[PDB]
Structure 1
Amino acid sequence: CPLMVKVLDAVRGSPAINVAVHVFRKAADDTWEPFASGKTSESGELHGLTTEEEFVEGIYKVEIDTKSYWKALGISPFHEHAEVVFTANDSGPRRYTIAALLSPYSYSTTAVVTN
């Protein structure tokens, strides 16, 4: 799988488990079309979102449903979600890991792009 999402919780020092993640791809008319989705595992990871065949060059949006995550833990958060928007390019390496570190009023994200 060429696309993986990993989510960490900076308050508890743990994987962020059971977080909903929605991936979109931008359509010709400039709208976001649903592409893949799931919930993070006990390791904070979401695998199997797509295949090499389906993950063509394009503009993608990964939406991590952070507000619902903080609410489930009884903590008041700021963001509705975290959105990571990027162009997938075949020149670049094959595997994209989108990592996100969550706090109630802050998030960080990085891309780890490897072969």
Structure 2
Amino acid sequence: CPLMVKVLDAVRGSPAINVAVHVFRKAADDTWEPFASGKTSESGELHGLTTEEEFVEGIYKVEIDTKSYWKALGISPFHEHAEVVFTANDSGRYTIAALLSPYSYSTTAVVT
């Protein structure tokens, strides 16, 4: 797995389960084209987005539907979603992690 996403809930201290995640890659006309998508597991993880074959150098956007997550819990959150945008410069594994709260989120990249 060259690309994994992991989502945590900072309020309840749990994985954030069943969170929709959409991945886009930048096209040569500077528009976003769908690339991969999924829902986080019981462990708050999403694997199997891509193969190494398909995950070439490029600019990618990882969109996490945080709003639906919080609304399902009876909480009116601040953000519409959380978006993580990065170049994969693949030269010399990417884990995109997000930690969520209703009015706040943090994200880090672990690249190994």
**TM-score, normalized by length of structure 2?**
0.99
Secondary structure, aligned partner of 2:43: coil
CA distance in 2, matches of 1:46, 1:69: 15
Structure 2 stretches of 5 or more lacking a match?
Answer: none
The number of residue pairs the alignment matches comes to 112
Corresponding residue of 1:65: 65
Displacement of 1:9: 0.1
CA offsets 1:19-66 (integer angstroms, 9 cap, x no match): 000000000000000000000000000000000000000000000000
CA distance in 1, matches of 2:90, 2:26: 17
Displacement of 1:91: 1.7
CA distance in 2, matches of 1:74, 1:112: 32
Structure 1 stretches of 5 or more lacking a match?
Answer: none
Identical residues among aligned pairs (%): 100
CA distance in 2, matches of 1:100, 1:85: 13
Corresponding residue of 1:108: 106
Which contiguous aligned blocks of 4+ residues in structure 1 show a shift greater than 4 angstroms? none
**TM-score, normalized by length of structure 1?**
0.96
Displacement of 1:72: 0.5
